[PDB]
Amino acid sequence: PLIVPYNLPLPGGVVPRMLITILGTVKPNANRIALDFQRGNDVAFHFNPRFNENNRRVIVCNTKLDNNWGREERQSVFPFESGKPFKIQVLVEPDHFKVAVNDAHLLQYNHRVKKLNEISKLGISGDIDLTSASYTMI
Ligand SMILES: [Cl-]
């Protein structure tokens, strides 16, 4: 197991065809999980499953620039379940990050930060037991 929060360096940033895979298990009675693809202090892509926002489960995505959050993109399709193992695959495409969970397509998030080769860290945090965080070129 890996210690959460975990920082996975992305050497030379991201590029299309780069696939990031995160394997873990959600804790029982989870409240939130976060993946933060960072460019320095900016967060190019924040992916945030929320297990209880006004008694609804929702995934909130956003970008943080100069410490300010932008417009949220919300997805009510919610594949995570407290206590169960999951696989999140984030595929960098030319115009967006494409996310699949447990081999099923979940959402796309168009690129707001354009300097992909400067998004060089992935922070993984929240209510999970983290098993593996890695990347490969497909
Ligand atoms: Cl940029």
Curated annotation (Swiss-Prot):
**Keywords carried by this UniProt record:** Acetylation, Cytoplasm, Differentiation, Disulfide bond, IgE-binding protein, Immunity, Innate immunity, Lectin, mRNA processing, mRNA splicing, Nucleus, Phosphoprotein, Repeat, Secreted, Spliceosome
The secretion signal range is none
Task: Answer yes or no on keyword Acyltransferase.
Answer: no
Recorded GO cellular component terms are: cell surface; collagen-containing extracellular matrix; cytoplasm; cytosol; extracellular exosome; extracellular region; extracellular space; ficolin-1-rich granule membrane
Q: What is its main location?
A: cytoplasm
Tissues in which the UniProt entry reports expression: A major expression is found in the colonic epithelium. It is also abundant in the activated macrophages. Expressed in fetal membranes.
This protein's source sits in the domain of life called Eukaryota
Q: Where is it located?
A: Cytoplasm; Nucleus; Secreted
Q: Where is this motif: Nuclear export signal?
A: 114-129
Q: What is its biological role?
A: Galactose-specific lectin which binds IgE. May mediate with the alpha-3, beta-1 integrin the stimulation by CSPG4 of endothelial cells migration. Together with DMBT1, required for terminal differentiation of columnar epithelial cells during early embryogenesis. In the nucleus: acts as a pre-mRNA splicing factor. Involved in acute inflammatory responses including neutrophil activation and adhesion, chemoattraction of monocytes macrophages, opsonization of apoptotic neutrophils, and activation of mast cells.
What protein am I looking at?
Galectin-3
User: What gene name is listed for this protein?
Assistant: LGALS3
Whole-protein coverage range: 113 to 250 of 250
